[PDB]
Amino acid sequence: REHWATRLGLILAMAGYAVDLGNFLRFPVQAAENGGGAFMIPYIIAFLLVGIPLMWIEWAMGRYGGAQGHGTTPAIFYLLWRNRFAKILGVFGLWIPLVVASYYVYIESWTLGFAIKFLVGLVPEPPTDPDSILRPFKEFLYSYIGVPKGDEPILKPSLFAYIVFLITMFINVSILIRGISKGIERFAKIAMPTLFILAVFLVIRVFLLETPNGTAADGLNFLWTPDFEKLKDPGVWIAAVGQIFFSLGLGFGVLITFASYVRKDQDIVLSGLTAATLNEKASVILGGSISIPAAVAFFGVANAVAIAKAGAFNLGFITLPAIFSQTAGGTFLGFLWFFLLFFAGLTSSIAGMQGMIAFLEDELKLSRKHAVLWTAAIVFFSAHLVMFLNKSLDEMDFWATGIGVVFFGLTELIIFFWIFGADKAWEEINRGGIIKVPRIYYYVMRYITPAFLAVLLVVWAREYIPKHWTVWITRFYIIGLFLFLTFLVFLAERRRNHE
Numbered sequence: 001r002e003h004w005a006t007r008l009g010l011i012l013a014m015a016g017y018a019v020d021l022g023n024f025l026r027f028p029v030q031a032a033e034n035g036g037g038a039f040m041i042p043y044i045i046a047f048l049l050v051g052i053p054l055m056w057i058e059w060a061m062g063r064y065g066g067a068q069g070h071g072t073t074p075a076i077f078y079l080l081w082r083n084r085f086a087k088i089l090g091v092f093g094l095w096i097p098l099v100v101a102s103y104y105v106y107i108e109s110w111t112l113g114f115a116i117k118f119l120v121g122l123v124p125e126p127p128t129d130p131d132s133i134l135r136p137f138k139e140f141l142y143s144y145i146g147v148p149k150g151d152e153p154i155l156k157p158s159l160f161a162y163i164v165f166l167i168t169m170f171i172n173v174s175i176l177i178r179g180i181s182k183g184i185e186r187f188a189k190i191a192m193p194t195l196f197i198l199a200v201f202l203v204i205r206v207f208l209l210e211t212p213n214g215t216a217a218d219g220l221n222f223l224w225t226p227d228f229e230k231l232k233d234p235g236v237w238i239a240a241v242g243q244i245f246f247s248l249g250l251g252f253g254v255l256i257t258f259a260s261y262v263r264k265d266q267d268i269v270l271s272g273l274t275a276a277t278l279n280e281k282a283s284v285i286l287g288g289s290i291s292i293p294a295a296v297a298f299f300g301v302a303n304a305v306a307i308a309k310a311g312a313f314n315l316g317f318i319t320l321p322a323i324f325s326q327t328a329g330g331t332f333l334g335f336l337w338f339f340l341l342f343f344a345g346l347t348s349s350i351a352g353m354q355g356m357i358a359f360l361e362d363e364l365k366l367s368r369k370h371a372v373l374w375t376a377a378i379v380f381f382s383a384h385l386v387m388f389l390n391k392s393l394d395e396m397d398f399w400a401t402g403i404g405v406v407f408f409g410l411t412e413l414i415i416f417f418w419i420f421g422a423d424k425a426w427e428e429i430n431r432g433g434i435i436k437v438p439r440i441y442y443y444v445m446r447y448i449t450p451a452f453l454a455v456l457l458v459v460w461a462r463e464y465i466p467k468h469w470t471v472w473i474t475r476f477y478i479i480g481l482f483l484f485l486t487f488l489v490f491l492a493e494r495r496r497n498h499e
Protein backbone atom coordinates (compact mmCIF):
# COMPACT_ATOMS: atom_id res chain seq x y z
CA ARG A 1 0.00 0.00 0.00
CA GLU A 2 1.13 3.54 -0.82
CA HIS A 3 2.03 6.02 1.94
CA TRP A 4 2.73 9.69 2.57
CA ALA A 5 6.47 10.37 2.44
CA THR A 6 6.78 13.39 4.73
CA ARG A 7 4.70 14.70 7.64
CA LEU A 8 4.85 18.14 6.04
CA GLY A 9 3.36 17.02 2.73
CA LEU A 10 0.63 15.14 4.59
CA ILE A 11 -0.51 18.31 6.35
CA LEU A 12 -0.18 20.28 3.11
CA ALA A 13 -2.30 17.79 1.17
CA MET A 14 -4.92 17.63 3.92
CA ALA A 15 -4.88 21.41 4.01
CA GLY A 16 -4.75 21.35 0.21
CA TYR A 17 -8.08 19.56 0.24
CA ALA A 18 -9.67 21.76 2.92
CA VAL A 19 -8.63 25.09 1.38
CA ASP A 20 -10.59 25.98 -1.76
CA LEU A 21 -13.02 28.52 -3.28
CA GLY A 22 -15.20 28.43 -0.15
CA ASN A 23 -12.46 29.93 2.02
CA PHE A 24 -12.17 33.00 -0.20
CA LEU A 25 -15.82 33.31 -1.23
CA ARG A 26 -18.39 31.33 0.76
CA PHE A 27 -17.04 31.99 4.27
CA PRO A 28 -16.76 35.80 3.93
CA VAL A 29 -20.38 35.96 2.73
CA GLN A 30 -21.74 33.81 5.55
CA ALA A 31 -19.94 35.92 8.15
CA ALA A 32 -21.23 39.27 6.87
CA GLU A 33 -24.79 37.95 6.63
CA ASN A 34 -24.73 36.43 10.11
CA GLY A 35 -23.41 39.03 12.54
CA GLY A 36 -20.09 39.96 10.94
CA GLY A 37 -17.49 39.68 13.68
CA ALA A 38 -20.15 38.30 16.00
CA PHE A 39 -20.33 35.32 13.64
CA MET A 40 -16.96 34.29 15.06
CA ILE A 41 -18.64 33.26 18.31
CA PRO A 42 -20.77 30.38 17.00
CA TYR A 43 -18.22 29.53 14.29
CA ILE A 44 -15.40 28.87 16.76
CA ILE A 45 -17.70 26.91 19.08
CA ALA A 46 -18.75 24.74 16.14
CA PHE A 47 -15.07 24.35 15.27
CA LEU A 48 -14.50 23.01 18.78
CA LEU A 49 -17.63 20.91 19.35
CA VAL A 50 -18.12 19.55 15.83
CA GLY A 51 -15.33 20.26 13.35
CA ILE A 52 -12.36 19.24 15.46
CA PRO A 53 -13.99 16.15 17.03
CA LEU A 54 -15.29 14.90 13.65
CA MET A 55 -11.97 15.60 11.91
CA TRP A 56 -10.12 13.35 14.33
CA ILE A 57 -12.67 10.59 13.76
CA GLU A 58 -12.33 10.52 9.97
CA TRP A 59 -8.56 10.49 10.45
CA ALA A 60 -8.96 7.57 12.86
CA MET A 61 -11.29 5.56 10.62
CA GLY A 62 -8.94 6.16 7.71
CA ARG A 63 -5.77 4.98 9.43
CA TYR A 64 -7.63 2.09 11.06
CA GLY A 65 -8.77 0.94 7.63
CA GLY A 66 -5.52 1.77 5.87
CA ALA A 67 -3.64 -0.65 8.11
CA GLN A 68 -5.93 -3.38 6.75
CA GLY A 69 -5.55 -2.30 3.13
CA HIS A 70 -8.88 -0.50 2.77
CA GLY A 71 -9.22 3.22 2.11
CA THR A 72 -12.97 3.52 1.53
CA THR A 73 -16.11 3.43 3.71
CA PRO A 74 -17.84 0.38 2.19
CA ALA A 75 -14.97 -1.73 3.56
CA ILE A 76 -14.17 0.36 6.65
CA PHE A 77 -17.77 0.51 7.87
CA TYR A 78 -17.76 -3.28 7.50
CA LEU A 79 -14.70 -3.38 9.77
CA LEU A 80 -16.21 -1.10 12.43
CA TRP A 81 -19.52 -2.93 12.03
CA ARG A 82 -19.71 -6.50 10.68
CA ASN A 83 -23.01 -6.12 8.79
CA ARG A 84 -24.60 -5.94 5.31
CA PHE A 85 -26.21 -2.57 6.06
CA ALA A 86 -22.74 -1.27 6.91
CA LYS A 87 -21.55 -2.03 3.38
CA ILE A 88 -24.56 -0.23 1.92
CA LEU A 89 -24.21 2.87 4.10
CA GLY A 90 -20.55 2.71 3.10
CA VAL A 91 -21.43 3.23 -0.58
CA PHE A 92 -22.67 6.73 0.31
CA GLY A 93 -19.07 7.73 1.14
CA LEU A 94 -18.12 6.54 -2.35
CA TRP A 95 -21.15 8.20 -3.91
CA ILE A 96 -20.91 11.66 -2.31
CA PRO A 97 -17.50 12.81 -3.59
CA LEU A 98 -18.15 11.18 -6.97
CA VAL A 99 -21.29 13.30 -7.34
CA VAL A 100 -19.50 16.48 -6.24
CA ALA A 101 -16.65 15.79 -8.67
CA SER A 102 -19.20 15.70 -11.53
CA TYR A 103 -19.77 19.45 -11.02
CA TYR A 104 -16.73 20.49 -8.96
CA VAL A 105 -14.05 19.75 -11.59
CA TYR A 106 -16.06 21.58 -14.26
CA ILE A 107 -16.40 24.76 -12.19
CA GLU A 108 -12.68 24.38 -11.48
CA SER A 109 -12.20 24.54 -15.24
CA TRP A 110 -14.00 27.90 -15.37
CA THR A 111 -11.39 29.53 -13.15
CA LEU A 112 -8.68 28.10 -15.40
CA GLY A 113 -10.40 29.32 -18.55
CA PHE A 114 -11.02 32.74 -17.03
CA ALA A 115 -7.41 32.83 -15.84
CA ILE A 116 -6.35 32.17 -19.42
CA LYS A 117 -8.75 34.73 -20.92
CA PHE A 118 -7.66 37.28 -18.31
CA LEU A 119 -3.94 36.61 -18.78
CA VAL A 120 -4.15 37.13 -22.54
CA GLY A 121 -6.50 40.08 -22.10
CA LEU A 122 -9.52 38.43 -23.69
CA VAL A 123 -11.96 40.08 -21.27
CA PRO A 124 -14.69 42.76 -21.49
CA GLU A 125 -13.74 46.43 -21.19
CA PRO A 126 -16.43 48.80 -19.82
CA PRO A 127 -17.87 51.38 -20.24
CA THR A 128 -20.10 55.42 -14.81
CA ASP A 129 -22.77 53.32 -13.08
CA PRO A 130 -22.60 49.90 -11.33
CA ASP A 131 -24.98 48.08 -13.70
CA SER A 132 -23.04 49.43 -16.67
CA ILE A 133 -19.88 47.80 -15.31
CA LEU A 134 -21.27 44.48 -14.08
CA ARG A 135 -23.39 43.67 -17.15
CA PRO A 136 -20.49 43.28 -19.61
CA PHE A 137 -19.04 40.74 -17.15
CA LYS A 138 -22.36 39.19 -16.20
CA GLU A 139 -22.72 38.46 -19.91
CA PHE A 140 -19.08 37.38 -20.15
CA LEU A 141 -19.71 34.63 -17.62
CA TYR A 142 -23.05 33.64 -19.16
CA SER A 143 -21.45 33.06 -22.58
CA TYR A 144 -18.80 30.81 -21.07
CA ILE A 145 -21.36 28.72 -19.17
CA GLY A 146 -23.99 28.95 -21.88
CA VAL A 147 -26.74 30.26 -19.60
CA PRO A 148 -30.09 29.65 -21.40
CA LYS A 149 -31.61 32.60 -23.24
CA GLY A 150 -34.97 30.94 -23.82
CA ASP A 151 -37.34 28.92 -21.65
CA GLU A 152 -35.44 25.71 -22.39
CA PRO A 153 -33.38 24.23 -19.53
CA ILE A 154 -30.52 23.89 -22.00
CA LEU A 155 -27.00 25.21 -21.47
CA LYS A 156 -24.70 25.85 -24.42
CA PRO A 157 -21.12 26.31 -23.13
CA SER A 158 -18.45 27.68 -25.46
CA LEU A 159 -16.12 25.34 -27.34
CA PHE A 160 -13.32 27.00 -25.38
CA ALA A 161 -15.03 26.35 -22.03
CA TYR A 162 -15.41 22.72 -23.09
CA ILE A 163 -11.78 22.48 -24.19
CA VAL A 164 -10.52 23.99 -20.93
CA PHE A 165 -12.61 21.37 -19.13
CA LEU A 166 -10.84 18.63 -21.09
CA ILE A 167 -7.56 20.28 -20.12
CA THR A 168 -8.56 20.57 -16.46
CA MET A 169 -9.44 16.87 -16.38
CA PHE A 170 -6.10 16.06 -17.99
CA ILE A 171 -4.30 18.10 -15.32
CA ASN A 172 -6.10 16.18 -12.57
CA VAL A 173 -5.20 12.85 -14.19
CA SER A 174 -1.59 13.98 -14.62
CA ILE A 175 -1.15 14.52 -10.89
CA LEU A 176 -3.34 11.59 -9.83
CA ILE A 177 -1.70 8.95 -12.03
CA ARG A 178 1.65 9.61 -10.34
CA GLY A 179 0.23 8.40 -7.03
CA ILE A 180 -0.06 9.68 -3.47
CA SER A 181 3.51 10.77 -2.74
CA LYS A 182 5.01 11.53 -6.15
CA GLY A 183 1.77 13.06 -7.41
CA ILE A 184 -0.58 14.53 -4.81
CA GLU A 185 1.91 15.14 -1.99
CA ARG A 186 4.55 16.41 -4.42
CA PHE A 187 2.02 18.83 -5.91
CA ALA A 188 0.67 19.81 -2.48
CA LYS A 189 4.18 20.99 -1.59
CA ILE A 190 4.18 23.22 -4.67
CA ALA A 191 0.57 24.39 -4.70
CA MET A 192 0.05 25.47 -1.07
CA PRO A 193 3.07 27.80 -1.03
CA THR A 194 2.09 29.10 -4.48
CA LEU A 195 -1.40 29.53 -3.04
CA PHE A 196 -0.20 31.45 0.02
CA ILE A 197 1.93 33.81 -2.08
CA LEU A 198 -0.97 34.59 -4.42
CA ALA A 199 -3.24 35.24 -1.45
CA VAL A 200 -0.82 37.56 0.36
CA PHE A 201 -0.18 39.51 -2.84
CA LEU A 202 -3.91 39.94 -3.45
CA VAL A 203 -4.43 40.86 0.21
CA ILE A 204 -1.76 43.55 -0.16
CA ARG A 205 -3.03 44.98 -3.45
CA VAL A 206 -6.62 45.08 -2.10
CA PHE A 207 -5.66 47.06 1.01
CA LEU A 208 -4.24 49.67 -1.37
CA LEU A 209 -7.51 49.94 -3.29
CA GLU A 210 -8.91 53.46 -3.07
CA THR A 211 -11.94 54.72 -4.98
CA PRO A 212 -14.23 57.75 -4.55
CA ASN A 213 -16.75 55.24 -3.15
CA GLY A 214 -14.61 53.88 -0.32
CA THR A 215 -11.47 52.10 0.86
CA ALA A 216 -10.43 48.59 1.87
CA ALA A 217 -10.56 49.72 5.50
CA ASP A 218 -14.29 50.27 5.01
CA GLY A 219 -14.43 46.71 3.71
CA LEU A 220 -12.73 45.13 6.72
CA ASN A 221 -14.88 47.48 8.80
CA PHE A 222 -18.25 46.33 7.45
CA LEU A 223 -17.20 42.68 7.48
CA TRP A 224 -15.77 42.50 11.00
CA THR A 225 -17.97 44.94 12.95
CA PRO A 226 -19.88 42.59 15.29
CA ASP A 227 -23.68 42.59 15.28
CA PHE A 228 -24.46 40.57 18.41
CA GLU A 229 -28.21 40.96 17.85
CA LYS A 230 -27.99 38.24 15.19
CA LEU A 231 -26.65 35.72 17.71
CA LYS A 232 -30.25 35.30 18.88
CA ASP A 233 -31.21 33.80 15.52
CA PRO A 234 -30.89 29.99 15.55
CA GLY A 235 -30.27 30.10 11.79
CA VAL A 236 -26.96 31.83 12.46
CA TRP A 237 -25.88 28.99 14.75
CA ILE A 238 -27.09 26.55 12.09
CA ALA A 239 -25.13 28.27 9.32
CA ALA A 240 -22.02 28.27 11.51
CA VAL A 241 -22.21 24.51 12.11
CA GLY A 242 -22.91 23.93 8.43
CA GLN A 243 -20.03 26.22 7.48
CA ILE A 244 -17.52 24.21 9.53
CA PHE A 245 -18.55 20.98 7.79
CA PHE A 246 -18.12 22.75 4.46
CA SER A 247 -14.91 24.52 5.52
CA LEU A 248 -13.14 21.36 6.73
CA GLY A 249 -14.54 19.06 4.04
CA LEU A 250 -16.22 16.72 6.51
CA GLY A 251 -18.80 14.15 5.44
CA PHE A 252 -17.48 13.54 1.93
CA GLY A 253 -15.29 10.55 2.78
CA VAL A 254 -12.25 12.40 1.42
CA LEU A 255 -10.27 12.63 4.68
CA ILE A 256 -10.89 8.94 5.38
CA THR A 257 -9.28 7.94 2.07
CA PHE A 258 -6.29 10.25 2.72
CA ALA A 259 -5.78 9.15 6.34
CA SER A 260 -5.71 5.54 5.12
CA TYR A 261 -2.30 6.28 3.59
CA VAL A 262 -1.01 7.32 7.01
CA ARG A 263 0.92 4.46 8.64
CA LYS A 264 -0.46 2.36 11.51
CA ASP A 265 1.20 4.20 14.40
CA GLN A 266 1.82 7.65 12.91
CA ASP A 267 0.24 10.69 14.61
CA ILE A 268 -3.21 11.79 13.45
CA VAL A 269 -4.17 13.97 16.41
CA LEU A 270 -1.66 16.81 16.02
CA SER A 271 -1.32 16.38 12.25
CA GLY A 272 -5.05 16.85 11.75
CA LEU A 273 -5.31 19.76 14.18
CA THR A 274 -2.58 21.46 12.15
CA ALA A 275 -4.15 21.01 8.71
CA ALA A 276 -7.48 22.11 10.15
CA THR A 277 -6.00 25.31 11.58
CA LEU A 278 -4.25 26.14 8.30
CA ASN A 279 -7.60 26.20 6.53
CA GLU A 280 -9.22 28.37 9.20
CA LYS A 281 -6.32 30.82 9.08
CA ALA A 282 -6.59 30.92 5.29
CA SER A 283 -10.29 31.72 5.63
CA VAL A 284 -10.28 34.40 8.33
CA ILE A 285 -6.95 36.05 7.46
CA LEU A 286 -6.63 35.73 3.68
CA GLY A 287 -10.09 34.90 2.36
CA GLY A 288 -11.98 37.58 4.26
CA SER A 289 -9.38 40.18 3.33
CA ILE A 290 -9.66 40.02 -0.47
CA SER A 291 -13.16 39.52 -1.88
CA ILE A 292 -15.42 41.53 0.45
CA PRO A 293 -13.03 44.45 1.07
CA ALA A 294 -12.36 44.93 -2.65
CA ALA A 295 -16.12 44.81 -3.22
CA VAL A 296 -16.84 47.48 -0.60
CA ALA A 297 -13.82 49.56 -1.62
CA PHE A 298 -15.15 49.95 -5.16
CA PHE A 299 -18.92 50.10 -4.67
CA GLY A 300 -18.97 51.67 -1.21
CA VAL A 301 -20.20 50.49 2.18
CA ALA A 302 -23.67 51.56 1.04
CA ASN A 303 -23.93 48.53 -1.25
CA ALA A 304 -22.10 46.18 1.13
CA VAL A 305 -25.34 44.49 2.18
CA ALA A 306 -26.51 44.15 -1.43
CA ILE A 307 -23.15 42.67 -2.42
CA ALA A 308 -23.21 40.04 0.34
CA LYS A 309 -26.81 39.14 -0.52
CA ALA A 310 -25.81 38.77 -4.17
CA GLY A 311 -24.15 35.48 -3.22
CA ALA A 312 -20.57 34.24 -3.18
CA PHE A 313 -20.68 33.17 -6.83
CA ASN A 314 -21.59 36.61 -8.20
CA LEU A 315 -18.92 38.11 -5.95
CA GLY A 316 -16.17 36.01 -7.49
CA PHE A 317 -17.18 35.57 -11.14
CA ILE A 318 -18.94 38.85 -11.92
CA THR A 319 -18.34 41.45 -9.21
CA LEU A 320 -14.58 41.04 -8.69
CA PRO A 321 -13.80 40.67 -12.41
CA ALA A 322 -15.75 43.88 -13.05
CA ILE A 323 -13.80 45.66 -10.32
CA PHE A 324 -10.56 44.39 -11.84
CA SER A 325 -11.38 45.90 -15.25
CA GLN A 326 -11.42 49.29 -13.53
CA THR A 327 -8.20 49.09 -11.49
CA ALA A 328 -4.64 49.76 -12.66
CA GLY A 329 -3.30 46.56 -14.22
CA GLY A 330 -6.41 44.68 -13.15
CA THR A 331 -6.39 42.25 -16.08
CA PHE A 332 -3.33 40.61 -14.49
CA LEU A 333 -5.09 40.94 -11.16
CA GLY A 334 -7.98 39.06 -12.74
CA PHE A 335 -5.48 36.40 -13.79
CA LEU A 336 -3.89 36.13 -10.33
CA TRP A 337 -7.36 35.85 -8.81
CA PHE A 338 -8.59 33.07 -11.10
CA PHE A 339 -5.23 31.30 -10.91
CA LEU A 340 -5.48 31.52 -7.13
CA LEU A 341 -8.91 29.91 -7.41
CA PHE A 342 -7.88 27.26 -9.95
CA PHE A 343 -5.18 25.88 -7.65
CA ALA A 344 -7.47 26.04 -4.62
CA GLY A 345 -9.95 23.79 -6.41
CA LEU A 346 -7.30 21.59 -8.01
CA THR A 347 -5.80 20.70 -4.63
CA SER A 348 -9.32 19.69 -3.64
CA SER A 349 -10.42 17.89 -6.82
CA ILE A 350 -7.40 15.57 -6.81
CA ALA A 351 -8.20 14.85 -3.17
CA GLY A 352 -11.85 13.99 -3.76
CA MET A 353 -11.37 11.83 -6.85
CA GLN A 354 -8.88 9.72 -4.89
CA GLY A 355 -11.64 7.83 -3.09
CA MET A 356 -12.86 6.18 -6.28
CA ILE A 357 -9.25 5.54 -7.32
CA ALA A 358 -8.63 3.92 -3.94
CA PHE A 359 -11.70 1.70 -4.25
CA LEU A 360 -10.75 0.35 -7.67
CA GLU A 361 -7.32 -0.44 -6.22
CA ASP A 362 -8.15 -1.75 -2.76
CA GLU A 363 -11.29 -3.72 -3.59
CA LEU A 364 -11.27 -4.49 -7.32
CA LYS A 365 -7.47 -4.78 -7.46
CA LEU A 366 -7.08 -2.43 -10.43
CA SER A 367 -3.71 -0.87 -11.25
CA ARG A 368 -3.28 2.79 -10.35
CA LYS A 369 -3.32 3.69 -14.05
CA HIS A 370 -6.63 1.93 -14.67
CA ALA A 371 -8.11 3.21 -11.41
CA VAL A 372 -7.38 6.80 -12.42
CA LEU A 373 -8.41 6.41 -16.07
CA TRP A 374 -11.79 4.86 -15.24
CA THR A 375 -12.45 7.31 -12.40
CA ALA A 376 -11.58 10.11 -14.80
CA ALA A 377 -13.82 8.44 -17.39
CA ILE A 378 -16.77 8.33 -14.99
CA VAL A 379 -16.45 11.92 -13.76
CA PHE A 380 -15.92 13.14 -17.34
CA PHE A 381 -19.04 11.37 -18.60
CA SER A 382 -21.30 12.43 -15.73
CA ALA A 383 -20.11 16.03 -16.05
CA HIS A 384 -21.88 16.34 -19.42
CA LEU A 385 -25.11 16.44 -17.41
CA VAL A 386 -23.78 19.44 -15.48
CA MET A 387 -22.48 21.14 -18.63
CA PHE A 388 -25.63 20.84 -20.76
CA LEU A 389 -28.63 20.55 -18.43
CA ASN A 390 -29.62 23.77 -16.68
CA LYS A 391 -29.86 23.55 -12.87
CA SER A 392 -28.54 19.98 -12.87
CA LEU A 393 -25.56 21.46 -11.02
CA ASP A 394 -27.81 22.69 -8.22
CA GLU A 395 -29.63 19.38 -7.89
CA MET A 396 -26.36 17.48 -7.52
CA ASP A 397 -25.01 19.97 -4.99
CA PHE A 398 -28.22 19.79 -2.97
CA TRP A 399 -28.22 16.01 -2.73
CA ALA A 400 -24.47 15.41 -2.47
CA THR A 401 -23.64 18.14 0.04
CA GLY A 402 -27.04 17.98 1.72
CA ILE A 403 -26.98 14.26 2.45
CA GLY A 404 -23.19 14.36 2.69
CA VAL A 405 -22.85 16.80 5.58
CA VAL A 406 -26.23 16.25 7.23
CA PHE A 407 -26.65 12.46 7.06
CA PHE A 408 -23.33 10.75 6.37
CA GLY A 409 -21.24 12.71 8.87
CA LEU A 410 -23.51 11.61 11.70
CA THR A 411 -23.32 8.03 10.43
CA GLU A 412 -19.54 8.17 10.86
CA LEU A 413 -20.02 9.15 14.49
CA ILE A 414 -22.48 6.39 15.34
CA ILE A 415 -20.71 3.58 13.49
CA PHE A 416 -17.27 4.41 14.90
CA PHE A 417 -18.13 5.80 18.32
CA TRP A 418 -21.40 4.06 19.17
CA ILE A 419 -21.40 0.80 17.20
CA PHE A 420 -17.68 0.04 17.10
CA GLY A 421 -17.44 1.14 20.73
CA ALA A 422 -16.40 4.50 22.19
CA ASP A 423 -13.42 3.17 24.18
CA LYS A 424 -11.99 1.15 21.29
CA ALA A 425 -12.57 4.26 19.18
CA TRP A 426 -10.85 6.68 21.55
CA GLU A 427 -7.73 4.52 21.65
CA GLU A 428 -7.68 4.41 17.85
CA ILE A 429 -7.61 8.21 17.71
CA ASN A 430 -4.97 8.78 20.39
CA ARG A 431 -2.66 5.89 19.44
CA GLY A 432 0.74 7.07 18.20
CA GLY A 433 -0.35 10.66 18.74
CA ILE A 434 2.35 13.26 19.40
CA ILE A 435 -0.11 14.96 21.71
CA LYS A 436 -3.21 13.37 23.23
CA VAL A 437 -6.83 14.41 22.74
CA PRO A 438 -8.19 16.31 25.78
CA ARG A 439 -10.23 14.09 28.11
CA ILE A 440 -13.25 16.39 27.74
CA TYR A 441 -13.58 15.58 24.03
CA TYR A 442 -14.72 12.05 24.86
CA TYR A 443 -18.05 13.54 25.91
CA VAL A 444 -18.13 15.93 22.97
CA MET A 445 -17.52 13.12 20.47
CA ARG A 446 -20.04 10.79 22.09
CA TYR A 447 -22.86 13.24 22.81
CA ILE A 448 -22.27 16.87 21.85
CA THR A 449 -21.09 16.16 18.30
CA PRO A 450 -23.89 13.77 17.32
CA ALA A 451 -26.45 15.95 19.13
CA PHE A 452 -25.46 18.89 16.95
CA LEU A 453 -25.35 16.72 13.83
CA ALA A 454 -28.87 15.51 14.61
CA VAL A 455 -30.13 19.08 14.96
CA LEU A 456 -28.42 20.32 11.79
CA LEU A 457 -30.05 17.34 10.06
CA VAL A 458 -33.53 17.96 11.49
CA VAL A 459 -33.64 21.74 10.92
CA TRP A 460 -32.31 20.95 7.44
CA ALA A 461 -34.93 18.22 7.28
CA ARG A 462 -37.86 20.36 8.46
CA GLU A 463 -37.00 23.06 5.90
CA TYR A 464 -35.84 21.12 2.80
CA ILE A 465 -38.11 18.06 2.95
CA PRO A 466 -41.01 20.31 1.89
CA LYS A 467 -38.83 22.31 -0.55
CA HIS A 468 -39.45 21.60 -12.48
CA TRP A 469 -39.62 18.18 -14.13
CA THR A 470 -36.03 18.21 -15.42
CA VAL A 471 -34.71 17.74 -11.88
CA TRP A 472 -35.72 14.09 -12.23
CA ILE A 473 -33.13 13.66 -14.97
CA THR A 474 -30.39 14.52 -12.49
CA ARG A 475 -32.03 12.46 -9.74
CA PHE A 476 -32.38 9.57 -12.20
CA TYR A 477 -28.65 9.67 -12.90
CA ILE A 478 -27.30 10.10 -9.38
CA ILE A 479 -29.55 7.29 -8.16
CA GLY A 480 -28.21 5.21 -11.05
CA LEU A 481 -24.74 6.02 -9.78
CA PHE A 482 -25.62 4.66 -6.33
CA LEU A 483 -26.98 1.44 -7.83
CA PHE A 484 -23.84 1.15 -9.94
CA LEU A 485 -21.62 1.59 -6.87
CA THR A 486 -23.68 -0.91 -4.89
CA PHE A 487 -22.97 -3.31 -7.74
CA LEU A 488 -19.22 -2.70 -7.58
CA VAL A 489 -19.25 -3.24 -3.81
CA PHE A 490 -21.24 -6.39 -4.54
CA LEU A 491 -18.65 -7.56 -7.08
CA ALA A 492 -15.90 -6.67 -4.61
CA GLU A 493 -17.10 -9.08 -1.91
CA ARG A 494 -17.69 -11.84 -4.47
CA ARG A 495 -14.12 -11.69 -5.77
CA ARG A 496 -12.87 -11.96 -2.19
CA ASN A 497 -14.82 -15.16 -1.54
CA HIS A 498 -13.17 -16.76 -4.58
CA GLU A 499 -9.66 -15.93 -3.36
Ligand SMILES: COCCCC/C(=N/OCCN)c1ccc(C(F)(F)F)cc1
Nearest residue numbers: 017018097100101104249348349352353
Ligand atom coordinates in the same frame (compact mmCIF):
# COMPACT_ATOMS: atom_id res chain seq x y z
C1 LIG B 1 -20.45 23.24 -2.27
O1 LIG B 1 -19.35 22.94 -3.03
C2 LIG B 1 -18.90 21.52 -2.95
C3 LIG B 1 -18.17 21.27 -1.58
C4 LIG B 1 -18.17 19.78 -1.07
C5 LIG B 1 -17.04 19.50 -0.04
C6 LIG B 1 -15.64 19.90 -0.64
N1 LIG B 1 -14.67 20.19 0.35
O2 LIG B 1 -13.43 20.51 -0.32
C7 LIG B 1 -12.71 21.45 0.40
C8 LIG B 1 -13.47 21.91 1.65
N2 LIG B 1 -13.96 23.25 1.52
C9 LIG B 1 -15.26 18.99 -1.78
C10 LIG B 1 -15.68 17.60 -1.85
C11 LIG B 1 -15.34 16.85 -2.93
C12 LIG B 1 -14.59 17.41 -4.00
C13 LIG B 1 -14.22 16.58 -5.19
F1 LIG B 1 -14.70 17.16 -6.34
F2 LIG B 1 -12.89 16.47 -5.33
F3 LIG B 1 -14.75 15.36 -5.11
C14 LIG B 1 -14.19 18.77 -3.93
C15 LIG B 1 -14.53 19.54 -2.84
Ligand code: NA
Nearest residue numbers: 018019247248
Ligand atom coordinates in the same frame (compact mmCIF):
# COMPACT_ATOMS: atom_id res chain seq x y z
NA1 NA C 1 -12.29 25.31 3.60
Ligand code: NA
Nearest residue numbers: 016019344348
Ligand atom coordinates in the same frame (compact mmCIF):
# COMPACT_ATOMS: atom_id res chain seq x y z
NA1 NA D 1 -7.99 22.82 -2.30
